[PDB]
Amino acid sequence: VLSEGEWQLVLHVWAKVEADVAGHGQDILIRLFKSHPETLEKFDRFKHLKTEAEMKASEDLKKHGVTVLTALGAILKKKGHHEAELKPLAQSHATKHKIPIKYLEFISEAIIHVLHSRHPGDFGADAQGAMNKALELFRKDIAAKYKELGYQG
Numbered sequence: 496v497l498s499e500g501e502w503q504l505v506l507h508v509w510a511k512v513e514a515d516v517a518g519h520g521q522d523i524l525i526r527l528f529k530s531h532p533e534t535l536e537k538f539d540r541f542k543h544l545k546t547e548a549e550m551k552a553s554e555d556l557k558k559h560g561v562t563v564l565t566a567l568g569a570i571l572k573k574k575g576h577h578e579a580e581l582k583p584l585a586q587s588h589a590t591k592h593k594i595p596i597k598y599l600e601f602i603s604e605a606i607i608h609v610l611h612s613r614h615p616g617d618f619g620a621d622a623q624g625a626m627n628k629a630l631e632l633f634r635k636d637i638a639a640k641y642k643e644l645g646y647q648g
């Protein structure tokens with residue numbers, strides 16, 4: 496359970512992200528795919544991209560980055576009361592996209608790296624710790640739905 500003070504830190508940096516959703520989403524997916532190449536293989540849509548320059552040039556990758564960050568933003572702004580938003584996401588990522596919880600850890604590390612790069616004055620250690628807690632709460636709740644469905648592994 497995050498405290499109100501921890502949520503305020505999370506949402507204050509998140510408000511900065513919402514000024515350039517697409518730029519952040521590109522940086523976060525490119526970092527995920529470079530750091531953890533197994534993740535790129537889950538996207539039939541992107542598995543043709545072989546270089547960071549090709550990733551940066553892909554408008555369809557930039558579009559998906561916006562989709563991802565808009566869904567994450569809607570979850571964060573619920574401050575934990577996010578059951579309605581997580582249900583469908585867990586369901587599609589377990590049963591259709593086949594994404595292991597570990598890959599949600601990896602994309603959480605990529606988000607935190609990008610926020611620190613782009614927003615260092617609003618992403619000191621207090622805020623990094625709070626964002627880490629928010630993203631762990633996301634993963635915990637998705638993992639419980641995966642387990643329900645037979646995918647926690």
Ligand code: HEM
Nearest residue numbers: 534537538540562563566567583584587592594598599602
């Ligand atoms: C913060 C974490 C994430 C969020 C909020 C998120 C969000 C979304 C949303 C909103 C969609 C489209 C609606 C749907 O299918 O449910 C989607 C699609 C998808 N996601 Fe995620 N996602 C996340 C992490 C991941 C990770 C880590 C992977 C792979 C490693 C992944 C793989 C996919 C795939 C393969 C699709 C379908 C893309 C396509 O072919 O159109 N997601 N995601």
